Amino acid sequence: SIVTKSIVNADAEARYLSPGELDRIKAFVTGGAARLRIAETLTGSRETIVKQAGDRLFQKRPDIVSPGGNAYGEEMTATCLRDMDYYLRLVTYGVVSGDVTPIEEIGLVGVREMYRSLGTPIEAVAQSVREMKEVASGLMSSDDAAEASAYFDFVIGKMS
Amino acid sequence: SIVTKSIVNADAEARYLSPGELDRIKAFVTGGAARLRIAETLTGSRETIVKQAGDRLFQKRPDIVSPGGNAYGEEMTATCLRDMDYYLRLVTYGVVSGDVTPIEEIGLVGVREMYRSLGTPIEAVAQSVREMKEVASGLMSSDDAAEASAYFDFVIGKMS
Amino acid sequence: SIVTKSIVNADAEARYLSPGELDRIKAFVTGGAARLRIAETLTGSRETIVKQAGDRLFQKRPDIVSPGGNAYGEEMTATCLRDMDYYLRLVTYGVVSGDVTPIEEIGLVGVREMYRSLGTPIEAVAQSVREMKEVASGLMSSDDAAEASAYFDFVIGKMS
Amino acid sequence: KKLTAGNPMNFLGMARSINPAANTIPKVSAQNINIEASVPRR
Amino acid sequence: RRFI
Amino acid sequence: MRMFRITACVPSQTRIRTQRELQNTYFTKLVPYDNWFREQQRIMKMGGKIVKVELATGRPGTNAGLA
Amino acid sequence: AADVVPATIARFSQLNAEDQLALIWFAYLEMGKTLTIAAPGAASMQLAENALKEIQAMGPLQQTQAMCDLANRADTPLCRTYASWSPNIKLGFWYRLGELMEQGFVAPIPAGYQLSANANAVLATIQGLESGQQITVLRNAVVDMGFTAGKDGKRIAEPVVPPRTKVSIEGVTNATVLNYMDNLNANDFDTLIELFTSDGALQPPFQRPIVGKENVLRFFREECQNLKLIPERGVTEPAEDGFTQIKVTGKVQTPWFGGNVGMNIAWRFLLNPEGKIFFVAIDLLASPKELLNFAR
Amino acid sequence: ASRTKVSIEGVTNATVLNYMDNLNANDFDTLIELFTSDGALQPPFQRPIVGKENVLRFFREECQNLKLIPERGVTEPAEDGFTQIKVTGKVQTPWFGGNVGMNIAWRFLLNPEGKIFFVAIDLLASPKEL
Amino acid sequence: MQDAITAVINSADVQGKYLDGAAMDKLKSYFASGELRVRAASVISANAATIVKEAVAKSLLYSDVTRPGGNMYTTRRYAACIRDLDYYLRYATYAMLAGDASILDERVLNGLKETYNSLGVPISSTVQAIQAIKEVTASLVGADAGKEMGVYLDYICSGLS
Amino acid sequence: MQDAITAVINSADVQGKYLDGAAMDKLKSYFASGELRVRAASVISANAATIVKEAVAKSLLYSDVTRPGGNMYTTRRYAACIRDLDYYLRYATYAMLAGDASILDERVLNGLKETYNSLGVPISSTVQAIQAIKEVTASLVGADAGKEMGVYLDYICSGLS
Ligand SMILES: *[C@H](C)[C@H]1/C(=C/c2[nH]c(/C=C3N=C(/C=C4\NC(=O)C(CC)=C4C)C(C)=C\3CCC(=O)O)c(CCC(=O)O)c2C)NC(=O)[C@@H]1C
Ligand SMILES: *[C@H](C)[C@H]1/C(=C/c2[nH]c(/C=C3N=C(/C=C4\NC(=O)C(CC)=C4C)C(C)=C\3CCC(=O)O)c(CCC(=O)O)c2C)NC(=O)[C@@H]1C
Ligand SMILES: *[C@H](C)[C@H]1/C(=C/c2[nH]c(/C=C3N=C(/C=C4\NC(=O)C(CC)=C4C)C(C)=C\3CCC(=O)O)c(CCC(=O)O)c2C)NC(=O)[C@@H]1C
Ligand SMILES: *[C@H](C)[C@H]1/C(=C/c2[nH]c(/C=C3N=C(/C=C4\NC(=O)C(CC)=C4C)C(C)=C\3CCC(=O)O)c(CCC(=O)O)c2C)NC(=O)[C@@H]1C
Ligand SMILES: CC1=C(/C=C/C(C)=C/C=C/C(C)=C/C=C/C=C(C)/C=C/C=C(C)/C=C/C2=C(C)C(=O)CCC2(C)C)C(C)(C)CCC1=O
Secondary structure, three states, X not given: OHHHHHHHHHHHOOOOOOHHHHHHHHHHHHOHHHHHHHHHHHXXXXXXXXXXXXXXHHHHOHHHHOOOOOOOOHHHHXXXXXXXXXXXXXXXXXXXXXXXXXXXXHHHXXXXXXXXXXXXXXXXXXXXXXXXXXXXXXXXOHHHHHHHHHHHHHHHHHOO | OHHHHHHHHHHHOOOOOOHHHHHHHHHHHHOHHHHHHHHHHHHHOHHHHHHHHHHHHHHHOHHHHOOOOOOOXXXXXXXXXXXXHHHHHXXXXXXXXXXXXXXXXXXXXXXXXXXXXXXXXXXXXXXXXXXXXXXXXXXXXXXXXXXXXXXXXXXXXXXO | OHHHHHHHHHXXXXXXXXXXXXXXXXXXXXXXXXHHHHHHHHHHOHHHHHHHHHHHHHHHOOOOOOOOOOOOHHHHHHHHHHHHHHHHHHHHHXXXXXXXXXHHHHHHOOHHHHHHHHOOOHHHHHHHHHHHHHHHHOOOXXXXXXXXXXXXXXXXXXXX | OOOOOOOXXXXXHXXXXXXXXXXXXXXXXXXXXXXXXXXXXX | XXXX | OOEEEEEEEOOOOOOOOOXXXXXXXXXXXXXXXXXXXXXXXXXXXXXXEEEEEEEEEOOOOOOOOOO | OOOHXXXXXXXXXXXXXXXXXXXXXHHHHHEOOOEOOOOHHHOOHHHOHHHHHHHHHOOHHHHHHHHHHHHHOOOOHHHHHHHOOOHHHHHHHHHHHHHHHHHOOOOOOOOOOOOXXXXXXXXXXXXXXXXXXXXXXXXXXXXXXXXXXXXXXXXXXXXXXXXXXXXXXXXXXXXXHHHHHHHHHOOOXXXXXXXXXXXXXXXXXXXXXXXXXXXXXXXXXXXXXXXXXXXXXXXXXXXXXXXXXXXXXXXXXXXXXXXXXOEEEEEEEEXXXXXXXXEEEEEEOXXXXXXXXXXX | OOOOOOOOEOOOOHHHHHHHHHHHHOOHHHHHOOXXXXXXXXXXXXXXXXXXXXXXXXXXXXXXXXXXXXXXXEEEEOHHHOEEEEEEEEEOOOOOOOOXXXXXEEEEEEOOOOOEEEEEEEEEOOOOOO | OOOHHHHHHHHXXXXXXXXXXXXXXXXXXXXXXXXXXXXXXXXXXXXXXXXXXXXXXXXXXXXXXXXXXXXXXXXXXXXXXXXXXXXXXXHHHHHHHHOOOHHHHHHOOOOHHHHHHHHOOOHHHHXXXXXXXXXXXXXXXXXXXXHHHHHHHHHHHHHOO | OOOHHHHHHHHHHOOOOOOOHHHHHHHHHHHHOXXXXXXXXXXXXXXXXXXXXXXXXXXXXXXXXXXXXXXXOOHHHHHHHHHHHHHHHHHHXXXXXXXXXXXXXXXXXXXXXXXXXXXXXXXXXXXXXXXXXXXXXXXXXXXXHHHHHHHHHHHHHHHHO
């Protein structure tokens, strides 16, 4: 989390947390309720978010669900949607922890290698998350969306 | 080249070229005309090798030439055939040189970075080279095809 | 052999053997019959090769078999002939494997330290191997002797 | 300007002659996929 | 996508 | 971070060293998790025998919280 | 609660081995019209390349037996090799066989065969599905064929059916040619060679003349297995020294030296003034089909 | 002999006539323009050859100083717009085997534009193989 | 590491004897199999990524191993698993080329079993994935070469227990 | 590094062209010279130590450079000087085999002047020594091969001057 990251940064210098590391931990913990709300709104409409996101992706990349595409066929489209729900679940982890480390450790370290082996076009996986950010942004207030979008965009950037 | 490859192997050990290396070089120069004939064959039928192999590729991978595919549209399709032409020419460089380094230094180092930046599905490129290997093989005797196949397989094995 | 050297070279780059390295391996196994012929020749003539070499050396170096010489007396001179037989056996190993590596690992690493400890004049050991080379080269054709010369020379070179 | 090697214009005629067939528009719908029951099990 |  | 504690016996191949060498021949050391694969490969290529490997730090199966 | 894809897969599993095999063939025919097209590039078909060469090299009887073994889950090395492949490879492998069946490289389904009542209904259900659902059902129809050491077994095997007239030529009625064409299409080399003199010679397509009864005899045993050559028209005249020079043309309904099922062919018979053939020339006539072309 | 153009009975195609003139003239460079970018050529007893560069290589490597005399050829249409022409003649110089007395045939599959999309040179081998 | 030739040499050298008829036979047999090994090695290198792709799809994907709670869950661990298999195939190819498993003892089975037991990597699933590699390779290189590759892939499997 | 063959390939590659007839002529010319280059290379390697010994004797010994205070004086510097001459001969042999001097510009001459000028190595004396190496090896391999080796040893000398 933001706490582990601060501690690691401080232990790297063999020293106690600086004022700023403490301020941000204090600010983050006071804001815990807002983060838990965003995590709850995302969790509640996860089914809606992914399926709406999938349809938008296909309108963007009809090739991937056409003969020769990685997600072609019912079971493969279902696996592709399954992956969109994975990366939604990790985005809720990022929001509550205030840190993108849980996202990297679970779903972005070696992702490029995993999708290379499977033959999935990873840029289309980035677009899928770009769709979920849009769909999710409409289910929440503008400020709940600004914080949630940051963690979506980190996934988008890491998958390019 | 076979000469450069053995020289760099010998220089890396601060030694003169070994008798085994010198014998390999002697055989290569003495079988030189046979290799150049294979390269002449590939060069002269480059139009049909690329066209037929490209025609087969899009049948094997229709998605890449569908909406949202990297090679959708005649212009993108032209660049894909250009790329296949690039790789065929490199195979002929490897044939006459008796070594893959001319192929590697020109078109395989950083190929993953280049095609991921462009969004091209690299494994489909491996397929396109594979298709060129059949068309080329069917234009020459089995022994000649075997000599060229080694270099086709090297390109295929690297991108894939 | 050249097989291990190729693999060790390939494993340093965490890569498969390139076509050129595989071609070299194929040539090496084809020439195996010639390698075995030479080694059989040396093995079959080993007793006469060492005996004549010893006579030639002692005429050139009467000091070593004179009083105070390292090989003085029947017991010591027999041991000196045994060492010559050892290095002839090593040269046979180099022949069949096509490389000097078995010679280096069994008989040339730390060879100076051992003989200096025993009080053996290393230059007289180097001379003995020269004598064995002369006698041995007379029992086989020009090509076969030229092949075997590299391994005889290698022992001499490492004994300076 | 005169076309040079590597220029994809040199292969437009080959592209047009091949005239590759695009896939038909897919009719798949995310809303009608049961993700849990459809993902393969091996 | 056009290269012209 | 996760860390391995590894024991290895690395012999000498191409030289007869005269200084004391026991310290670099049979040793036990801590290796960061992210260096073990590379380090294990290097010891193997130098002819070393990996005699013991332990996960000194961290837990097996962790998904989040590797530090 | 439609759940069409798995329910359709359930129906296929109930069909007997014969119906399953017949169904997928007729599904292959619909591909591109009512069923989805194939994308073999999305499968690692190099895994099945060796198995596909073995089938091609088989006799017509063995080929059909091989595919019946696949549908019957019989324990054969091909079925074991089949079972180790991935679902996409399996489907792509069956696709290749269907492509070759149409190309005549592999033996076809029994002549004038008709899909059964149950199989046709399961086909129509597949025809109404969306593209993505079709491939999924098609993937699962074949996923279980071949041999797997475990829980598997079919109730009824579906053996292949156990199974020659005179060929008419327009303008040619020479018996010597008639015996040859009928003997050739009958693969009766032990009889066809007796129409060639001991010093005869044959010229295969894209080859030099081969001189010798034993040579010509061996050639038939090698490069003319299960080969069908149809003559349609010709003409007969004496040319020189009493030898008769007949030029009968036609078509070959079987791949041959890079030829296709629909390639026209020509024969130039040169036989003795007193009987059997001294020379013969065979030349497949080139046409928009130029897939038999080498380079230099 | 050189100062007379080639004459073929029953055929008047320019591409063929130019082909027969250039082939005898030995100017392979002028000869190969008649072939299409996709054009092929079938040497007798051999599989076809595809590619102008490859077709030329056969010409300059195997078709040196040969004289062929067209005798009588026929023309007919071919599918897809190709004009199929058949020409029968005789060889003079030794050629793929056979001297003087062989009978040659030249099956031309001409591209509507006029270029030689395919030509087949066949030696109708006499009862003596030569 | 020692190839088949150096193995025969070492057997004679440890006894301090010249290469006798039986040792020459072993050298001859290795020489005669050389073309077949180099053929199989060329095939494996061309399809190496594909071989691991299909072996994984056959033995690991859509199972408890890759679902949450499985050791191959997470992209981090999935990629780590793909790497291991990639190294197994390549080293089995070296061993096949060399005609001797010593390289497997030294550069594969040297601390690997204890690393796997420390991290909780399931040996059973690893052995099945390797066995799937052996099945996939045989479909590519034939039976004579595929049996040889299976010998050395089996060596790794039993090395991990 | 670039040899005669890759010089042809590179000249075609920079224009994006397959190898045409003229390019194949250049490759043939080099293939025809292969036997001469290989034979010369083996003779030089078998005589490298003696080539340098005679080059040193006639060009360096019994002069200011070997007397005390000289750059070749002290056993270390004498040994370094022989080692350097071994390098020049060995890389010239590489270049002669490759039929291309680019290896000399890359693996010999790069920074060589700076090295010698900072150490006080006499540039004229090393050039005279290399020229002596050129003379000696010519009398060993013949005029044709001697003149071919002369190109690449003269290339080094011109780099140093
Ligand atoms: C000689 C009486 C016996 C013998 C010796 C032998 N030793 C080795 C290898 C090593 N020996 C040591 C020992 C030390 N290194 C040190 O730094 C010190 C402390 C001051 C000691 C005592 C070590 C560490 C090694 C391995 C590393 C190395 O050699 O540098 C060998 C070679 C082993 C091999 O197979 O490589 C041998 C032969 N062997 C006998 O049979 C004698 C009875
Ligand atoms: C959908 C937007 C894209 C797509 C997806 C797709 N993925 C697979 C298969 C797998 N995906 C994963 C991913 C993960 N596992 C993890 O543990 C993590 C972190 C939580 C991730 C991200 C895995 C492991 C698989 C393998 C299957 C398995 O579950 O074992 C497929 C199927 C590929 C196939 O051929 O089986 C698909 C279709 N495909 C696209 O084209 C979209 C861009
Ligand atoms: C894949 C089939 C299975 C699997 C694999 C897996 N392995 C690790 C971690 C490591 N694997 C190794 C392996 C090697 N080191 C060597 O020197 C050799 C010889 C070339 C091998 C094969 C090592 C050293 C590690 C640790 C260091 C590192 O991974 O960089 C993991 C990760 C475990 C974790 O907690 O991160 C995994 C997942 N897991 C399965 O479930 C498959 C059956
Ligand atoms: C006498 C016991 C042995 C002997 C001597 C010998 N030496 C040479 C030639 C040279 N000797 C040296 C030596 C040194 N240069 C240094 O810088 C140092 C340390 C200060 C030493 C010891 C050199 C450089 C030469 C080369 C000639 C020169 O000085 O320019 C010779 C002549 C060899 C020849 O062929 O010219 C001889 C005879 N020779 C023996 O046999 C004795 C065992
Ligand atoms: C798009 C896409 C793809 C999908 C590709 C697809 C959809 C491929 C599907 C291909 C299909 C539908 C292949 C079916 C082939 C059936 C054959 C050869 C049956 C022969 C029957 C015989 C011999 C029986 C004869 C018989 C005999 C003998 C009898 O005696 C009497 C009975 C009977 C008549 C049965 C890929 C998977 C490639 C990749 C991924 C991807 O995106």
